[PDB]
Design a protein around this ligand. Structure first.
Ligand SMILES: O=c1[nH]cc(F)c(=O)[nH]1
Ligand SMILES: O=c1[nH]cc(F)c(=O)[nH]1
Lengths: 293, 293
């Protein structure tokens, strides 16, 4: 019903397209036959988390056959990993705007060549909370910049280009509904601030560099909280400004690993942090199951 | 002689430090005993490229003993891989400014706790060339922004903070020296433009998004060429801005994978691309064997 579209008049004249970072080529691969049935894409930082995600949702849908694995569709490259089970695609994206950008440029063309339509895309990951207990799942209402505005800036040919961040409201609602049914963890809906640096960029005091005080930070965070911000991470803004523009329905679901009003160090036991990081997976695999039933 | 320093008062007050992304902590690890003897750090995108590097410099230094390999010091995470042979450290950094910044904050802190001094740090990578044949090695004179200036801008508590990019001039001459001795491939010195996006960020026409034309790309790449730029990549600017400020001598050495005046697609056969990628490694590992002879 709603096809994945590119916003680029230069693609039609190309004889082939090398998705360099995926190690996939329009000449070597039957894209419509490989990926044409994709309806749900889950993305996150880590290749192992994304394979775990693909195993878990394969089980949830019961396409989980005994023994056998989900091959890395991008095995051979080491930039991104990719997995698939029925209409679900799993894709790692590393850390930061540039890393997910490259993945998203290539994934969106991949889906376009595959002539995919009605695609829901969900980012799962981790974040720092503002005024939330650690381990809280935040469903992102708006992906915002460091002014707390629903905007994404990039430089194109030396000029600053402002594009809007848009996450699907209906999708936000569906995921919230799912979480109240599950009732396995605190879930909130808030704005998510995207940064280009984890230390000075997130107002941390424990970096190799720090140009400000404990109270400069505290007052920036409180300002953020007042403007609707509930968490902080590194990939939401570019994700929200590309997916919508290309006809994907996008959501972001992150767990908080700490409350940033109370500290900076991520000091919880490994096991606790591990339990926290299952939570976006749990919510999103359950949501996919509920949508495909 | 010259110690690795931090530009952060809050670090001495701290009782313990968790290097979250390395899975290293002061409370579990002996930093001087682990890393005190490190004099050279080589950084690059991929874990497997950085393992191949430690093996190569190991061989070069004659510390290549029969059979055994190099344990990943950061095993148990998948953010960054890290390897050591004698006084050389090898650390991967993934893709983009944010990925390498996180690595750099925690790496500099790691060198500090280890009481390291006289540390030379080199980035080896890949890049798109401007007016150079594919496979040319570029030693970066200045890491520049998208207006061709030796500055790195980040946002700190909502505010634009501009720092200078500084790459060691003597180090550039030393690397060039080694290249003239080796005489195994074309080596140029020039400026490197760091970008936040591989497609539109670098004036490519083949992204999922493109508002401009061939003529626009061409004029922007020419303007860059006239301002000293010979190659384009994604990590040099934050690298150049952080390393020197913290008392490390920094260099960037990238091979070009294509000539951007001629195209955007990376269509060289895989084996050709591999040969190209061994080149910065060849030069840097030889530089290191030379400094330690
Ligand atoms: O970008 C972030 N990711 C995860 C965190 F815990 C955090 O504080 N910031
Ligand atoms: O950032 C880049 N790395 C490698 C390339 F070939 C290129 O064009 N751009």
């Amino acid at each position: 019903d709603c096809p994945v579209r590119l916003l680029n008049p230069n693609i039609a004249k190309m004889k082939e397209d090398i998705l360099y970072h995926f190690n996939l080529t329009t000449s070597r691969h039957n894209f419509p036959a490989l990926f044409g049935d994709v309806k749900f894409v889950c993305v996150g930082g880590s290749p192992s988390r994304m394979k775990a995600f693909i195993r878990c949702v394969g089980a949830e849908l019961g396409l989980d056959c005994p023994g056998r694995d989900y091959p890395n569709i991008c095995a051979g490259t080491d930039r991104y990993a990719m997995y698939k089970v029925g209409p679900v695609l799993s894709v790692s994206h590393g850390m930061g705007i540039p890393s997910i950008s490259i993945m998203l440029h290539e994934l969106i063309k991949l889906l376009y060549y595959a002539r995919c339509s009605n695609v829901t895309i969900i980012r799962i990951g981790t974040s720092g909370g503002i005024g939330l207990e650690p381990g809280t799942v935040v469903i992102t209402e708006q992906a915002v910049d460091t002014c707390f505005k629903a905007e994404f800036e990039q430089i194109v040919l030396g000029k600053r280009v402002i594009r809007k961040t848009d996450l699907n409201k209906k999708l936000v609602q569906e995921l919230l509904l799912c979480s109240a049914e599950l009732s396995e963890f605190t879930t909130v809906v808030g704005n998510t601030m995207c940064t280009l640096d984890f230390y000075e960029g997130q107002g941390r005091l424990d970096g190799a560099l720090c140009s400000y005080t404990e109270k400069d930070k505290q007052a920036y965070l409180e300002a953020a909280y007042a403007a609707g911000v509930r968490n902080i991470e590194m990939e939401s803004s570019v994700f929200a400004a590309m997916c919508s523009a290309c006809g994907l329905q996008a959501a972001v679901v992150c767990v908080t690993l700490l409350n940033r009003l109370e500290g900076d160090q991520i000091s919880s036991p490994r096991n606790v942090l591990s339990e926290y990081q299952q939570r976006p997976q749990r919510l999103v695999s359950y949501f996919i199951k509920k949508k495909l039933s």
